[PDB]
Nucleic acid binder design. Structure first.
Ligand SMILES: [Mg+2]
Ligand SMILES: [Mg+2]
Ligand SMILES: [Mg+2]
Ligand SMILES: [Mg+2]
Ligand SMILES: [Mg+2]
Ligand SMILES: [Mg+2]
Ligand SMILES: [Mg+2]
Lengths: 170, 258, 59, 167
RNA sequence: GGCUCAGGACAACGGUUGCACCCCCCGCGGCGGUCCUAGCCGGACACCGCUGGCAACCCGGCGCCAAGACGUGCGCGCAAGGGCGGGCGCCCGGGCGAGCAGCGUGACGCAGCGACGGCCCGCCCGGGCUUCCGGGGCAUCACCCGGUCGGCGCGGUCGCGGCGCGCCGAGGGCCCGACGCCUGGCGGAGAAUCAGGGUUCGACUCCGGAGAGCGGGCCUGCGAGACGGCCCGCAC
């Protein structure tokens, strides 16, 4: 019975989407062959998802969600490869993108002391994740998605609001 | 930004283990493409001129090679810049000399004279298993040799014994703990040891730990670990069994020889 | 169409050795195909305990 | 001439970057093919010598293509009648220009020649009884020289029907 | 290969990643099934003979002949592209850290090789872009950007990408110094000096980058925005 409820919920999302005439085009998952939704039995899978590997687990929201994102690392058509980094959220104002703040130390040999430095890194945030300012995120490297974006969010660790901004190298 | 591929090689930019003299000349030979690449090979002329001393100039080496007096795995080669590599066969029938190209403890190429019982084959390291046209399985080796329809039991990083006469596999050595290996690159080139641990890091290099027979222990990455048999070596090895002496011991040896 | 003696050398004449060369080439190609077929057959006979995926010859 | 180099763009902060070399042939571009539906006339396709000696062909005019009905597994070669919708601009539709993603009308003769009676998807049978069937383009003309696709069905068919019904 | 350092100040460059977004001549090793006159096919030009223009540079017309040149092509179905083919919380072979490859089947299309057989695949060197860190001075430069920031769709490219176009929303950077201006600014490996800590320089031998009077465009070719290759404007 649990699978049946999922299929009905997914099926509605496809048909209420066709009633949003404001949209210029019909957005779909490339892997799934439209036409399975005309089958009354639940003999076929209606949603596609994958495991990115490296020990990370797929969120239940992506598996049970009703959203389309070709740049998502779980339901889209991109692959994670290279460097995995961490940081805190700096701004979340774009449609599906954020700015990540990274902090590190730089050593000066003449004075035998350090300097605190930071860089800004832009990344893509899939709808499966909810993020506010100050949370800690883990980002994986992918192929160029835009002029400044080469990373994708993979894990979010909430932080309490009102907490003190602190220098947090990661 | 050069408009095309490079064809020259300055003497100072050449690999160190070739041991070219600084003032020999401005230029150095540029090996052509072949079984082995630039950084893991050595041109034929260097062996024929600066090692065996059979020739004193480029022209003599070219004449000798044209006369087809040198065989490399049973096939005469006329290219003065043909690249020679590890676990090759170097036989000169006209002087009844047969050698196998290996690495010395110091990390240089050496010629180990061999017998006829073991001079009709070579050992190859398998680096890749891929599907070719029509889904037919294949395999590739460190010497740029591709074999079709191999045994399923053969996996990556194994060692393969191919007969030179025909070019067919006869047996293979699995990659496992307790198998004698030889290091083919890095700071530990030429050493012989036995695998003791295999530690794999996700998304990065795999590290191999082996112990020398005397008791020494050293580490290297899997990309330059070469199995040369089970427990005991399948092929001949230089006089010293891959034991690198210390500076003090080497200085004592030098003084003794002086 | 139909001192020294100078005449042009004839071209496009098929003497004995051309026939032998063509026959040898044909035989070599035929035996190559036969050996490949035999190797495929023996490999297929092997793998009795595993799957396989090769392009089946049509016709 | 035409280039896709990033050296002529501004930086993420909005600053202007200096030009430190001349134009290179790695980063060149070419004019669009603008493939036109036929509706000295015939199919015309051109060949282009690309980098490495590779060959690329752009269609300038075509009239036919292969279309597949996935649900019943029926594929035939059909004639394209005209473009009726495009998600990028109405000007492409007016000019009858073929690109990937275009929604077109194909002749129903090949598909009504058989299985006009078999109980399949009802929404497609009604189209079969008529003269044209809504379809979509899946290939990239201008790169491969073909215009292939599939017959619509499911939610997308309803979406496009509602889109182009009130007109 | 050789010459030089004009240009260019989040760029070039140095170390460290990646292409599951890529191209690659020679060489080495494999592979080699091709739908519908083969004792061996067809026509030309070059050089050359005759005949000529023009100060030079340059070429014209007629005429028999060769190919490892050009064209056609004997041949056991095969190029590119396109539709369909896995799950029910996650994990526990061709191959991976990673659903990546290959294959079957329904439709299209007949690309390449073949008048002394090589299309194709792998390696190799090389290139293209790309991750992280470093990367001049002036605050009598304090606010700057408007394809500028992001999303959707198509096109083009060897290929990802505001690279370009249409629509949508608004964003992005900054005293941890943005933007602007200046430099008698190519960078590094390194050089001079000398308790230790440091200061100054770095046209020139090795590596990398850029250019061939200034600014643009392009053919050939695997590979050039080539200049001891061609076209245009300007100045000589
Ligand atoms: Mg035929
Ligand atoms: Mg021919
Ligand atoms: Mg200057
Ligand atoms: Mg230089
Ligand atoms: Mg140049
Ligand atoms: Mg030029
Ligand atoms: Mg030149």
């Amino acid at each position: 019975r649990r699978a049946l409820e999922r299929a009905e919920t997914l099926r509605k999302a496809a048909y209420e989407m066709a009633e949003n005439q404001h949209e210029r085009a019909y957005h779909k998952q490339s892997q799934i062959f439209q036409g399975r939704f005309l089958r009354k039995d639940n003999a076929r899978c209606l949603r596609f998802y994958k495991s990115i590997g490296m020990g990370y687990h797929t969120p239940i929201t992506a598996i049970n969600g009703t959203y389309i994102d070709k740049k998502c690392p779980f339901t889209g058509n991109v692959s994670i490869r290279g460097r995995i980094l961490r940081g805190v959220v700096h701004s979340a104002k774009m449609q599906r993108s954020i700015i990540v703040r990274r902090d590190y130390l730089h050593f000066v040999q003449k004075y035998k002391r350090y300097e605190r430095r930071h860089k800004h890194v832009a990344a893509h945030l899939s709808p499966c994740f909810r993020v506010k300012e100050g949370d800690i995120v883990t980002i994986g490297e992918c192929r160029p998605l835009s002029k400044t974006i080469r990373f994708n969010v993979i894990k979010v660790e909430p932080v309490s609001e009102a907490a003190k901004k602190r220098f947090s190298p990661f | 930004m050069a408009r095309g591929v490079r064809k020259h090689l300055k003497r100072l930019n050449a690999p160190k283990h070739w041991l070219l003299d600084k003032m020999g000349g401005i230029w150095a030979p540029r090996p052509t493409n072949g079984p082995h690449g630039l950084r893991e090979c050595i041109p034929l002329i260097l062996i024929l001129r600066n090692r065996l001393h059979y020739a004193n100039t480029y022209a003599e080496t070219s004449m000798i090679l044209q006369d087809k007096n040198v065989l490399i795995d049973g096939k005469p080669r006329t290219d003065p810049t043909f690249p020679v590599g590890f676990m090759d066969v170097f036989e000169i029938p006209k002087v009844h000399k047969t050698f196998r190209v290996l690495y010395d403890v110091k990390g240089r190429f050496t010629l180990v004279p061999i017998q006829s019982n073991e001079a009709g084959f070579k050992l190859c390291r398998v680096q890749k298993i891929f599907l070719g046209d029509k889904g037919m399985p294949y395999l590739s080796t460190h010497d740029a040799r591709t074999i079709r329809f191999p045994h399923p039991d053969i996996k990556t990083n194994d060692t393969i014994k191919i007969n030179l006469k025909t070019g067919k596999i006869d047996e293979w050595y699995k990659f496992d703990i307790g198998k004698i290996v030889m290091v083919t690159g890095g700071r530990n080139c030429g050493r012989i040891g036995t695998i003791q641990a295999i530690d794999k890091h996700m998304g990065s290099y795999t590290m191999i730990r082996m112990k020398d027979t005397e008791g020494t222990e050293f580490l290297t990455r899997l990309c330059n670990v070469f199995v040369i048999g089970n427990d005991s070596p399948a092929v001949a090895i230089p006089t010293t069994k891959g034991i690198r002496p210390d500076i003090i011991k080497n200085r004592e040896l030098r003084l003794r020889s002086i | 169409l139909f001192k020294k003696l100078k005449y042009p050398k004839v071209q496009r004449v098929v003497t004995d050795e051309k026939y032998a060369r063509k026959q040898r080439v044909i035989a070599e190609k035929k035996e190559i195909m036969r050996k490949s077929l035999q190797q495929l057959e023996e490999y297929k006979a092997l793998l009795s305990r595993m799957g396989k995926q090769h392009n089946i010859r049509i016709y | 001439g035409i280039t896709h180099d990033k050296m002529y763009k501004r930086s993420k902060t909005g600053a202007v970057q200096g030009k430190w070399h001349k134009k290179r042939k790695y980063n060149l571009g070419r004019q669009p093919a603008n493939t036109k539906l036929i509706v000295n006339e015939g199919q015309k396709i051109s060949t282009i010598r690309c980098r490495g000696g590779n060959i690329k062909r752009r269609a300038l005019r075509l009239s036919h293509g292969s279309f597949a009905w996935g649900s019943a597994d029926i594929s035939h070669k059909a004639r394209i009648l005209q473009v009726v919708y495009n998600s990028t601009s109405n000007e492409l539709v007016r000019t009858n220009t073929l690109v990937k993603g275009c929604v077109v009308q194909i002749d129903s003769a090949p598909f009504k020649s058989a299985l006009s009676n078999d109980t399949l998807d009802k929404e497609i049978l009604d189209q079969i009884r008529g003269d044209h069937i809504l379809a979509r383009i899946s290939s990239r003309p201008g790169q491969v020289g073909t215009a292939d696709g599939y017959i619509l069905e499911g939610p997308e068919l309803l979406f496009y029907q509602k889109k182009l019904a009130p007109k």
